Amino acid sequence: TSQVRQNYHQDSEAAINRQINLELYASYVYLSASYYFDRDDVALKNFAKYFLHQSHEEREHAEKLMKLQNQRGGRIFLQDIKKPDRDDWESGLNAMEAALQLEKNVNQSLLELHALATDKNDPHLCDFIETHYLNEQVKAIKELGDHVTNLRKMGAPESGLAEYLFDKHTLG
Amino acid sequence: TSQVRQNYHQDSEAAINRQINLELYASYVYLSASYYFDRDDVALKNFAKYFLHQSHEEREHAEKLMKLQNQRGGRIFLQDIKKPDRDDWESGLNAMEAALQLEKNVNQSLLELHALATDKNDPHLCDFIETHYLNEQVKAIKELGDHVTNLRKMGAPESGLAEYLFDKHTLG
Amino acid sequence: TSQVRQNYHQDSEAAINRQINLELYASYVYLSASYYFDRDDVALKNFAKYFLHQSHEEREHAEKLMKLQNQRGGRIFLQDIKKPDRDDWESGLNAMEAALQLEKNVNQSLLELHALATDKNDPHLCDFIETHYLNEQVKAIKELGDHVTNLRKMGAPESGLAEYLFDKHTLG
Amino acid sequence: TSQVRQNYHQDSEAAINRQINLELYASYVYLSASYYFDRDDVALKNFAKYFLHQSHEEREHAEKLMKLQNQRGGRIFLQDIKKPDRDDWESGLNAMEAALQLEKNVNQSLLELHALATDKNDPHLCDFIETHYLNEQVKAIKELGDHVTNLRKMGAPESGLAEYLFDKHTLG
Ligand SMILES: [Mg+2]
Ligand SMILES: [Mg+2]
Ligand SMILES: [Mg+2]
Ligand SMILES: [Mg+2]
Ligand SMILES: [Mg+2]
Ligand SMILES: [Mg+2]
Ligand SMILES: [Mg+2]
Ligand SMILES: [Mg+2]
Ligand SMILES: [Mg+2]
Ligand SMILES: [Mg+2]
Ligand SMILES: [Mg+2]
Ligand SMILES: [Mg+2]
Ligand SMILES: [Mg+2]
Ligand code: NA
Ligand code: NA
Ligand code: NA
Ligand code: NA
Ligand code: NA
Ligand code: NA
Ligand code: NA
Ligand code: NA
Ligand code: NA
Ligand code: NA
Ligand code: NA
Ligand code: NA
Ligand code: NA
Ligand code: NA
Ligand code: NA
Ligand code: NA
Ligand SMILES: [Pd+2]
Ligand SMILES: [Pd+2]
Ligand SMILES: [Pd+2]
Ligand SMILES: [Pd+2]
Ligand SMILES: [Pd+2]
């Protein structure tokens, strides 16, 4: 047993390793989406910048969970980072819709993690999830919902003018 | 009844007074350890500085609980601050190991306090403990574990050179 | 065919996608090594910082290859990022030796990539590899060789004092 | 024989004179396109500014090749600069498509020049072409491809609103 370990359930330790993988997976999805918009036949540079920034944020999310695992005396076990579900993201609207679904899936995993921490009476882990993850997810989901709404109302994806102007005025 | 008191159980009030005493006791333990390293036959000035800083932090922890007691309309009842369990702390490694055990004991008391606040449906007290105490304890326990590990790997306590160099490079 | 594509062989396009995966894999290896040294029973913070910096550099290497793929009109195809070969990296010396082998493996892949670009008469791709990758690898391999040599001469891994002092004086 | 000449084939000397003419021709094409957009019945000032900047860059490309010819001991022989193939460039999209084709034609000439320098074992000339010309062409072709894509997706050339807004938001 680690000399620092206290009130840290083996199920919580395992769930944190699963969350680390999911954050790394989300980083990879956003990296894929970013360079789709860097293609010469897509060419929306602020969509590319937006998703690249999101990718780097997810890597930070993963590193903070790795730090937490060691802080509590658990042991990090890494797994393969699966490739994203699409190679071609179709349009600015479709990528925003995919990102919305991704962030809701990550949120559901964090809510299940919080339920486990609550069931195992781990208030430090509960506070960690609430402080660093839950409102971040609520803000991300709201922002992506806003983006999807605007793109739809502007006429995307059929209007290439809509995605061009959204790229300039909202993401620029 | 205090005019400010609301949703503050008498058991919580009593548990806060017990925690105040424990924080003051921890301040006293660290004060004792600090001046052990100021002895002419020990003479590790950065161990002394490190433990003195920890002593002053524990006094701040106690004062914040005294403030909380009054904020919620409870009444502070102080008890004797017991002297530390050792007069002679033996070595830098032994003192670090004692500090690790002390911080884990304080953490266990805070976890029992949080369980009580949860059982009495006191979300303000739960948040107070989480925000100001629980991660502070996790960070302190991790730091002390790190220190113990390094001292052991360097050859302490048998190597006086190890404790000298740790004093200079980690605590300096 | 992409409207920008010129003198860019399909074999080169495929080899660039394989190199993207290898750079991402190297980023993951270094991330794993970094947080091993953040464990409370290892506790070498400058080893952790050094490998984390290397991890972020490899992600930059991968992103630059993704940019190149799009610049030349190829299409990015991502694959799973395999988990590193170790969960436990044993010691500072063993991790440095693993990093040395990793960087030599990445270098060999880049040399095979340059041979392909030479065979397909792609001077832009040759120059890209030479300018941004080949000397970076030579410098990384030399630095890691230097680190391995010093750790061995100091008495690592058996001397925990050696790894402690190397952490402070070379990586700090 | 020039006192500075060393490892500089007469075929390379001739090919450099041909490249000088092609760079000057490209400068002239871009100058023509620039002032088309300055016409009162076209009136897209940022298209005009963009192509004028490209024109001045091509003149710099030509001057650097003239410097190289003298550095290596070859002798500059100038030829007529042919007028561009169009007087009327039709639209912003059509001019961008013409510029894309021009830059790909210049790139093909540079690749043939590099093949000659490789065949004559002239590594200084190879490095000169790679360092100062080949990535410049790849970046120019990618940028023009991006511009063509955006104009097409926005509805150009039939939408005068598309070219107006592209002039303001991408070229402004
Ligand atoms: Mg995340
Ligand atoms: Mg698969
Ligand atoms: Mg918050
Ligand atoms: Mg305290
Ligand atoms: Mg007594
Ligand atoms: Mg907090
Ligand atoms: Mg690399
Ligand atoms: Mg496997
Ligand atoms: Mg070469
Ligand atoms: Mg170089
Ligand atoms: Mg040119
Ligand atoms: Mg004529
Ligand atoms: Mg260059
Ligand atoms: Na435990
Ligand atoms: Na357990
Ligand atoms: Na937040
Ligand atoms: Na908020
Ligand atoms: Na009450
Ligand atoms: Na009560
Ligand atoms: Na804290
Ligand atoms: Na923390
Ligand atoms: Na090609
Ligand atoms: Na091909
Ligand atoms: Na370099
Ligand atoms: Na060098
Ligand atoms: Na010669
Ligand atoms: Na000759
Ligand atoms: Na360049
Ligand atoms: Na570039
Ligand atoms: Pd359980
Ligand atoms: Pd009660
Ligand atoms: Pd030293
Ligand atoms: Pd071939
Ligand atoms: Pd010849």
Tab-separated table of C-alpha atoms in Angstrom, chain A residues 37-45 90 158-162 164-165 168-169, chain D residues 142 145-147 149-150 153-155 159 161-162 165-171:
chain	number	residue	atom	x	y	z
A	37	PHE	CA	-10.410	22.304	-41.310
A	38	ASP	CA	-6.773	22.850	-42.346
A	39	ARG	CA	-7.348	20.845	-45.554
A	40	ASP	CA	-7.069	22.893	-48.736
A	41	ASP	CA	-10.600	21.782	-49.747
A	42	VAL	CA	-12.117	22.860	-46.403
A	43	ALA	CA	-9.928	25.849	-45.476
A	44	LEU	CA	-11.613	27.301	-42.376
A	45	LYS	CA	-8.627	28.424	-40.295
A	90	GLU	CA	-18.071	16.787	-43.358
A	158	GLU	CA	-25.550	23.938	-47.332
A	159	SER	CA	-24.450	27.596	-47.157
A	160	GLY	CA	-20.671	27.712	-47.444
A	161	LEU	CA	-21.082	31.458	-46.884
A	162	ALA	CA	-22.596	30.719	-43.455
A	164	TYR	CA	-17.196	31.203	-43.746
A	165	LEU	CA	-18.835	34.077	-41.870
A	168	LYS	CA	-14.667	34.960	-39.167
A	169	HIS	CA	-17.082	36.516	-36.686
D	142	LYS	CA	-1.565	25.916	-50.310
D	145	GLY	CA	-5.844	26.588	-52.901
D	146	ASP	CA	-7.402	27.736	-49.619
D	147	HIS	CA	-8.526	31.000	-51.261
D	149	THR	CA	-11.911	26.822	-51.986
D	150	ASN	CA	-13.398	29.611	-49.883
D	153	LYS	CA	-17.961	27.690	-51.253
D	154	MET	CA	-19.124	31.286	-50.764
D	155	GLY	CA	-20.765	31.302	-54.211
D	159	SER	CA	-22.194	36.131	-56.118
D	161	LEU	CA	-21.422	39.637	-52.452
D	162	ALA	CA	-19.117	36.629	-51.973
D	165	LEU	CA	-16.927	39.793	-48.350
D	166	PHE	CA	-13.848	37.683	-49.122
D	167	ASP	CA	-12.022	40.883	-50.097
D	168	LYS	CA	-12.915	42.364	-46.694
D	169	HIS	CA	-12.482	39.409	-44.352
D	170	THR	CA	-9.709	37.270	-45.849
D	171	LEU	CA	-7.621	39.761	-47.835
